[PDB]
Amino acid sequence: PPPVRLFGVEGTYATALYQAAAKNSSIDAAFQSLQKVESTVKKNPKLGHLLLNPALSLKDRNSVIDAIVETHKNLDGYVVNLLKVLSENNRLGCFEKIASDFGVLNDAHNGLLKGTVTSAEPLDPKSFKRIEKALSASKLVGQGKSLKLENVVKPEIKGGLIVELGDKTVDLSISTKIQKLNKVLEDS
Amino acid sequence: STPITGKVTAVIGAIVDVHFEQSELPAILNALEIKTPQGKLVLEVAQHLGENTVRTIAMDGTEGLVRGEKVLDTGGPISVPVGRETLGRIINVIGEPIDERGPIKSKLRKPIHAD
Amino acid sequence: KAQPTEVSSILEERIKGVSDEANLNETGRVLAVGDGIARVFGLNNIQAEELVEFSSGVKGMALNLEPGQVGIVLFGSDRLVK
């Protein structure tokens, strides 16, 4: 019984890392180790990201893994061997993707159903809050699970708002309605 | 002088791939030997496939090969013996006489990749 | 507080031959050669159809600008390429 699929390409490292780690939980600890190692990649951005290049070596890649485990107890559990394999497999560059994806799987386990409330201009907090609770208590979320929510600014839309989550959306905005306004009048 | 060994990482058809070690890569068109239980077997450095991995072309019957066999560098290309000692004798591709007249002693070995 | 700076000061100096005299403005490493073509990692500020020079001294020219690498065809034998 796997979680929500990462669907093949290069999430399969993260997929195997989860489903082999999770057989004995520790995925919060493995998760925090992943957060910490992506942090120390980010905390040393010069040649933490600039040294995920493929043209180095096998040996020097393994030594960069040694520098990662050299930084205190940055790695913990399977995630070093993960890197041992990753280093050997030289898929280190697509490591950022793995991180974010494990985060998605993890907060799916928590049930944070990330949403969005697209607009062409940011809005007041009262609207945020009222919408937030709306979806939260809506059949969408079955409760027992959270509900983030992000307003974004979109100029490509002419205003209004659109709610999004669980590949399920509602647009009541302006742009689409103008469109429907032009379509209906486009007949004889 | 140390010799450079490598591992037979891939056998495809009549094309053999070798994983070498760090900065030990022979340049292109170098003869490589591997001692079979039947004899010796020759490769020629064709492609640096990257990451200390070199694709080469076989020179005899490539059957029976285990992955990861310790192939051996020869440094240079295939050099054959020359001189009037070579006259009237039957030589294979790798410079060996197969006339069963013993070896061809020769003061010069010369590579087959000149300008 | 100190040991991440130690790991950084090692790692910037661990590939100091590769990380310095570098940053691929006018430098590159021979990633893989075959058939008179070097695919070369690096060479970010390079131009299209620009002459390049090897450390062995045989010259090539770049044809395929790519995000990952640069295809360079060779004017001499590829035996001088490692």
From Swiss-Prot, chain A:
Keyword set, alphabetical order: ATP synthesis, Hydrogen ion transport, Ion transport, Membrane, Mitochondrion, Mitochondrion inner membrane, Transit peptide, Transport
GO biological process: proton motive force-driven ATP synthesis; proton motive force-driven mitochondrial ATP synthesis
Domain of life where this protein originates: Eukaryota
GO MF: proton-transporting ATP synthase activity, rotational mechanism
UniProt GO cellular component terms: mitochondrial inner membrane; mitochondrion; proton-transporting ATP synthase complex
A Pfam family: OSCP
InterPro entries to which the protein is assigned, alphabetical: ATP_synth_OSCP/delta_N_sf, ATPase_OSCP/d_CS, ATPase_OSCP/dsu
Stored SUPFAM superfamilies: N-terminal domain of the delta subunit of the F1F0-ATP synthase (SSF47928)
Subcellular location: Mitochondrion; Mitochondrion inner membrane
Subunit structure as annotated in this protein's UniProt entry: F-type ATPases have 2 components, CF(1) - the catalytic core - and CF(0) - the membrane proton channel. CF(1) has five subunits: alpha(3), beta(3), gamma(1), delta(1), epsilon(1). CF(0) has three main subunits: a, b and c.
Family label: Belongs to the ATPase delta chain family.
NCBIfam families linked to this entry: ATP_synt_delta (TIGR01145)
Primary role: Mitochondrial membrane ATP synthase (F(1)F(0) ATP synthase or Complex V) produces ATP from ADP in the presence of a proton gradient across the membrane which is generated by electron transport complexes of the respiratory chain. F-type ATPases consist of two structural domains, F(1) - containing the extramembraneous catalytic core and F(0) - containing the membrane proton channel, linked together by a central stalk and a peripheral stalk. During catalysis, ATP synthesis in the catalytic domain of F(1) is coupled via a rotary mechanism of the central stalk subunits to proton translocation.
Further facts: Present with 32400 molecules/cell in log phase SD medium.
Protein's recorded name: ATP synthase subunit 5, mitochondrial
Gene, per the UniProt record: ATP5
From Swiss-Prot, chain B:
Location of Phosphothreonine modifications: T74
Compartmental location: Mitochondrion; Mitochondrion inner membrane
Superkingdom of origin: Eukaryota
Stated family: Belongs to the ATPase alpha/beta chains family.
Additional facts recorded: Present with 164000 molecules/cell in log phase SD medium.
Quaternary context: F-type ATPases have 2 components, CF(1) - the catalytic core - and CF(0) - the membrane proton channel. CF(1) has five subunits: alpha(3), beta(3), gamma(1), delta(1), epsilon(1). CF(0) has three main subunits: a, b and c.
Function as written in the Swiss-Prot or TrEMBL entry: Mitochondrial membrane ATP synthase (F(1)F(0) ATP synthase or Complex V) produces ATP from ADP in the presence of a proton gradient across the membrane which is generated by electron transport complexes of the respiratory chain. F-type ATPases consist of two structural domains, F(1) - containing the extramembraneous catalytic core, and F(0) - containing the membrane proton channel, linked together by a central stalk and a peripheral stalk. During catalysis, ATP synthesis in the catalytic domain of F(1) is coupled via a rotary mechanism of the central stalk subunits to proton translocation.
Protein name (database record): ATP synthase subunit beta, mitochondrial
Biological source species: Saccharomyces cerevisiae (strain ATCC 204508 / S288c) (Baker's yeast)
Gene name of the record: ATP2
UniProtKB/Swiss-Prot annotation, chain C:
Residue list for modification Phosphoserine: S19
The organism's place on the tree of life at top rank: Eukaryota
Subcellular location: Mitochondrion inner membrane
Subunit structure of this chain's protein: F-type ATPases have 2 components, CF(1) - the catalytic core - and CF(0) - the membrane proton channel. CF(1) has five subunits: alpha(3), beta(3), gamma(1), delta(1), epsilon(1). CF(0) has three main subunits: a, b and c.
Misc: Present with 41500 molecules/cell in log phase SD medium.
Protein's job: Mitochondrial membrane ATP synthase (F(1)F(0) ATP synthase or Complex V) produces ATP from ADP in the presence of a proton gradient across the membrane which is generated by electron transport complexes of the respiratory chain. F-type ATPases consist of two structural domains, F(1) - containing the extramembraneous catalytic core, and F(0) - containing the membrane proton channel, linked together by a central stalk and a peripheral stalk. During catalysis, ATP synthesis in the catalytic domain of F(1) is coupled via a rotary mechanism of the central stalk subunits to proton translocation.
Protein family per UniProt: Belongs to the ATPase alpha/beta chains family.
Entry protein name: ATP synthase subunit alpha, mitochondrial
Native source species: Saccharomyces cerevisiae (strain ATCC 204508 / S288c) (Baker's yeast)
Residues shown, of full length: 39 to 120 of 545
